[PDB]
Amino acid sequence: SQSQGIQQLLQAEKRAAEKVSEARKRKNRRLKQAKEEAQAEIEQYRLQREKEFKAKE
Amino acid sequence: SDADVQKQIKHMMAFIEQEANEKAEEIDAKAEEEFNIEKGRLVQTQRLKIMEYY
Amino acid sequence: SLAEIVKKDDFVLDSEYLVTLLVVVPKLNHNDWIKQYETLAEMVVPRSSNVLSEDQDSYLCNVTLFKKAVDDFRHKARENKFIVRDFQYNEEEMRADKEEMNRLSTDKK
């Protein structure tokens, strides 16, 4: 039956789709991590500016 | 004939997997760029707004 | 019309690296085509040919292959007088032919 041939095409395509999909999942996760680290650093800046402002006051 | 065709495809089909891995590695490089771009834009914009308040 | 013979299971489509091609061959020349089609380009798997139907003159088959192979395959098919007739499972067109065949034959009565 032709399935023994055709499945070799579909195997390469499925392996390709998995590798690209895993990189897309990592891209989405890295975008979320960038937001989360930015949210921490802006609070550290607010706290530093607060200490400077209290010293100037 | 048929055995040489099966050997030729079994070798050549690896180039599709290699190009798919190279595309995934380009998406991973775009992920590292976008992480730095998004983090930098958010940190600087908010830091400037916070600084102006003080 | 391809609508009388085409079905999805004979096709490889909706894919990044994969294509399907369609070729008609005279019923005597088919005995050469069965082996020669696998020699028209690199990156063709063995037994990629799926016949849709025979007739009084000829056979039509789908060939399944990687995207790099397709233009060498079609050009060397033309060089060997094998006639390219690409109909990549056009579901909207086969349905339109069936719908209008049923409608016009009914409306005429």
Side-chain angles (χ1 to χ4, degrees):
Chain A
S1 304
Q2 291 97 331
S3 60
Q4 182 65 15
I6 291 159
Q7 180 59 18
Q8 301 174 45
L9 301 177
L10 297 177
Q11 182 164 54
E13 179 68 24
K14 185 175 184 285
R15 287 173 175 174
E18 286 175 11
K19 291 286 187 179
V20 171
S21 180
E22 289 175 8
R24 287 173 174 172
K25 291 174 181 183
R26 289 187 297 260
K27 184 177 184 296
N28 296 343
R29 292 169 189 177
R30 294 292 290 138
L31 179 68
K32 292 178 179 182
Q33 291 172 3
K35 297 181 179 184
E36 291 170 7
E37 289 188 26
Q39 189 69 9
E41 290 180 15
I42 67 175
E43 290 298 320
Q44 295 162 3
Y45 287 122
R46 184 186 63 72
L47 291 163
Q48 178 59 29
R49 296 296 90 81
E50 188 192 306
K51 288 174 179 179
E52 291 167 10
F53 176 70
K54 287 174 171 178
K56 291 175 189 185
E57 177 175 45
Chain B
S1 182
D2 302 43
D4 297 337
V5 179
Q6 186 56 85
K7 289 174 181 182
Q8 287 161 14
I9 192 70
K10 187 171 182 180
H11 174 68
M12 293 292 295
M13 71 190 296
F15 295 120
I16 299 298
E17 297 184 2
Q18 291 167 23
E19 287 179 25
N21 290 333
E22 288 168 21
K23 183 166 180 167
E25 288 169 29
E26 288 171 21
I27 293 159
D28 291 324
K30 290 174 183 182
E32 291 182 356
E33 289 176 24
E34 180 164 56
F35 166 92
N36 282 281
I37 291 162
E38 184 77 338
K39 184 178 176 183
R41 287 177 177 173
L42 291 170
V43 172
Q44 294 298 354
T45 304
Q46 291 290 357
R47 185 189 68 73
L48 291 166
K49 289 179 178 185
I50 290 164
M51 181 182 75
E52 288 161 25
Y53 162 81
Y54 287 107
Chain C
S1 176
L2 285 307
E4 301 306 326
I5 65 177
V6 165
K7 68 187 186 295
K8 71 180 179 62
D9 296 349
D10 295 318
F11 295 75
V12 174
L13 297 172
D14 302 340
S15 296
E16 181 163 27
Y17 296 102
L18 310 182
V19 182
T20 297
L21 303 176
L22 292 82
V23 179
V24 63
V25 62
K27 69 177 187 289
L28 299 181
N29 293 1
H30 185 63
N31 295 283
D32 296 344
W33 172 253
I34 288 162
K35 297 302 189 181
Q36 290 185 359
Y37 91 80
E38 299 187 354
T39 72
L40 298 181
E42 69 193 356
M43 297 181 77
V44 179
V45 70
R47 302 175 180 162
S48 295
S49 180
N50 300 266
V51 172
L52 297 175
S53 62
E54 81 301 333
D55 67 20
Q56 65 275 3
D57 292 335
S58 69
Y59 295 85
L60 176 63
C61 74
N62 290 12
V63 175
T64 55
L65 74 187
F66 289 111
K67 185 172 283 177
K68 292 187 183 184
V70 305
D71 290 336
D72 291 350
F73 180 95
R74 288 185 287 203
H75 191 63
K76 295 291 174 181
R78 291 185 298 251
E79 186 182 319
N80 291 277
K81 307 184 182 181
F82 299 123
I83 303 174
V84 178
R85 300 293 279 173
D86 289 335
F87 185 96
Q88 292 176 338
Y89 188 78
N90 301 302
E91 184 173 7
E92 299 82 4
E93 297 193 36
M94 65 181 67
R95 287 178 183 283
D97 285 0
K98 288 176 175 182
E99 286 169 10
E100 292 297 83
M101 179 56 77
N102 290 349
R103 188 183 68 85
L104 276 301
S105 61
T106 305
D107 290 351
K108 185 180 177 189
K109 291 177 179 181

